[PDB]
Every structure is written in structure tokens, then in C-alpha cells.
């Protein structure tokens, strides 16, 4: 079986270096090209450079330039991807993967793949969520339904998770996914559909648990004036 | 150098599907299902590499490479990319519809009082229940585009198999008040859905 076989993931601070693992087996590892593509959460496929494994030469795209080395150890079938000065956007999956199989002459595309390695980089530490209130009104307010909801704002680690009146509300809630901001920190929010009718007779809290903080809030959500 | 691929193509078991790349012979399309690697389908426009499926197939008109696959089957669902030499398209998902299209539902939420009163401000933009599971999302103060600022999650599964994201526009509270209205716009299946909401004291 031609297959190459990645280091298990990893996870860095910004500023440090990473090293991934490639190890060839069931073809002749010093015949073909080694390649390294990379994958951010969510997005496409990018080159990022090749290495020659009888020669030692490298290729790297331009993206990377100063800050990949590409080696590789014949003795033991294998080729290194270090990336250094790492930044929170080389947050990735990491593939090595080369052409060992086709009938083409130009060493792309790759037929080979190793499973990838995740690297996360992030300079965030531990922090519990903010919390605030989206008031339902007029405005979210459809089939005589108001949605209203909790913004639970710049927390780390995940996982946040969100009920609503202590787990006596299913109905119609519908809780996002975070998004990861920028500054390393996550956001979430929750929503529930409820009876127009009801605001102002019914309270409506969300439950918000961040157990990597020990943290729980209890927001109540009224609706504007 | 610049491999352009539409964002979602979709199309019903048994149906047939093409998926063209647009750039400027060594086009190359692979498929990729979550949490694996990248699986090289077609290489140089047509070549199928051993095992490939005979219902994959690959063409090539002027600038513009297509792969068709014939015969859709439910494992087909997936992202594929085209590829030239080192360069790759930014990706298609494929949706093997398994149940009726459906346009996003979009909630668009203000800044909270009490985020303001914190000198922050947050829109909140939650899009639901849309199928299949692809949308671009901009946002505009007043009718002008706004790119600063903006976060965007990827599409998430819904209990009824429907998908989710959100997006979420951070402002300073004097750029959010000196605005007549601030608007979510959310694409999908190439038409739009905006949701707008407006400084209110």
C-alpha cells in the first residue's frame, strides 16, 4: 500500500515553530517529489511548497518564504514541514502529499495523501463569556412569533453551551455555532422563537455554561421600551 | 494561477452534475469528504487514476474545465477542487439533494443597551435553515459595503438536516449611532435575503 503517514496534531502559541512528520512507505520514497499542501478551517487547499528527496532542493510558495524549511531523512523514508514565527492565521490542517502512480509528466496533481495534520495557533488563555441580552421586538417578529436571544460574547476555550429556562424551553431554540474572532476569543449566540403574545407574561432566561471557566450566567432577556 | 469554481453545485440522485474551472491540459479535480484528505478523481482534464468511478468524468472547453459526474450517488457529496500544477481552485460543495431547497431564515439583532453602556457593539446576524448548506454573507452601513470588522462562521447541520451560520459585525458604539441603518445580506442558491436594523436610543 503506497500511503505516507502524518504526525498527530498539534498546538502552538503565536510567535513559536511547528515540525510535521511525513513518513513514506510502500513506494520508493526517493523516487518522486514530496509536496506540502495546507487547509485553514473552512477553507480551500494551498500549495505550499515541494522538496526534492535524492537532491535536498525545495520550492516554496512565496506566502511562506522565510519561514518554511522543507527537509527530509531517506534513511527513514521521511520529510519534515517546519513552519516558524507562527501566526494565529497558520491555523490548519497540513498535507503532505506527492504523484507517484499517473501517467503525467508533471509531478502535479498528487495522487498520494498522508491524513493531514491539525495545527492550532493561539495566543488566547482561559476567559469566561460576557453575556448580553437580545431583546426581541416588532422588528424580529414574524407569525405573531418574536425571536429573542443571548449574545455570549469573547470566551476561550470552547465549548459554551446554552439553555433556555433551565431546560423547560425547547422549543424553538437554536444555538450557533461561535465564531472565533480575531483576537483568539470565541462568540456564540442563541435565539428562541416564542408567542409575541407572551413577552411580559412568560420570563425568558438563557442558561450559559462555560465549564472550561467554571462559569455559569443567567441572563434574563426582556424586550426593549 | 487564479482557478475560479462555483461556490455550490447540487443535483438529485441518479441526476447528472458538472462542475466547471475557469482560469486563464493539466486541469485536475479532487474530491474531499470531511476529515480527510484531498482524493484525486480526474488529473489532466480526462484521466481517471485506478479505482475512480467510470461515472467521473473530465472535459475541457476553451479556459474552462468541467467535471461531470453522471449517475449521482449520496457518497458524491462532498467538496471538490480543481487543480493546475500548484495552483487550486477555491473548492465546490457538491449536495446530493435529499430533501426540497430551502432560503435561509435571517434574524438580524442589534447592539444590546448593555453592550453599548460597555462602549462595545455587536450586530448579530443568524441565518437558518437553508439547504443546501452554502451562502456568502455581506454586510453594509447604510448602502455602503463593510468588510472591517466582519466574522463569518461556516455552515453547520441542523437537527432537520437543514444548515446554520452566523455572522457578526463589530463596531465602535459612534460608528453603529452614526448610521441611519446597518444591513445583513445573505446569498444562497444566488439569490439574497437582507435583514436591517437601525439605531433606535
Known sequence: ?225 | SALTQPRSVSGSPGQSVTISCTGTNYVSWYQQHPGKAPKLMIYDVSKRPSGVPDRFSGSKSGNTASLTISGLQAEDEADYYCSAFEYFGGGTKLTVLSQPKAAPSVTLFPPSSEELQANKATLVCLISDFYPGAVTVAWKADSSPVKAGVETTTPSKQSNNKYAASSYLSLTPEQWKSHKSYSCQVTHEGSTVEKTVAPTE
Open chain 1, 1 to 225: 500500500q503506497v500511503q505516507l503517514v502524518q504526525s498527530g496534531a498539534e498546538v502552538k502559541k503565536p510567535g513559536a515553530s511547528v515540525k510535521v512528520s511525513c513518513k513514506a512507505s510502500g513506494y520508493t520514497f526517493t523516487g518522486y517529489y514530496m509536496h506540502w499542501v495546507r487547509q485553514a478551517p473552512g477553507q480551500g487547499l494551498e500549495w505550499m511548497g515541494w522538496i526534492n528527496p535524492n537532491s535536498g532542493g525545495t520550492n516554496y510558495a512565496q506566502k511562506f518564504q522565510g519561514r518554511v524549511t522543507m527537509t527530509r531523512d531517506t534513511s527513514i523514508s521521511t520529510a519534515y514541514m517546519e513552519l516558524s514565527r507562527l501566526r494565529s492565521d497558520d491555523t490548519a490542517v497540513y498535507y503532505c502529499a506527492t504523484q507517484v502512480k499517473l501517467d503525467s509528466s508533471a509531478g502535479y496533481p498528487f495522487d498520494i495523501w498522508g491524513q493531514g495534520t491539525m495545527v492550532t495557533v493561539s495566543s488566547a488563555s482561559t476567559k469566561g463569556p460576557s453575556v448580553f441580552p437580545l431583546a426581541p421586538s416588532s422588528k424580529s417578529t414574524s407569525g405573531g412569533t418574536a425571536a429573542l436571544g443571548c449574545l455570549v460574547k469573547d470566551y476561550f476555550p470552547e465549548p459554551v453551551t446554552v439553555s433556555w429556562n433551565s431546560g423547560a424551553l425547547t422549543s424553538g431554540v437554536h444555538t450557533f455555532p461561535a465564531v472565533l474572532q480575531s483576537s483568539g476569543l470565541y462568540s456564540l449566540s442563541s435565539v428562541v422563537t416564542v408567542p409575541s403574545s407572551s413577552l411580559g407574561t412568560q420570563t425568558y432566561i438563557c442558561n450559559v455554561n462555560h465549564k472550561p471557566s467554571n462559569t455559569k450566567v443567567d441572563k434574563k432577556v426582556e424586550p426593549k421600551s
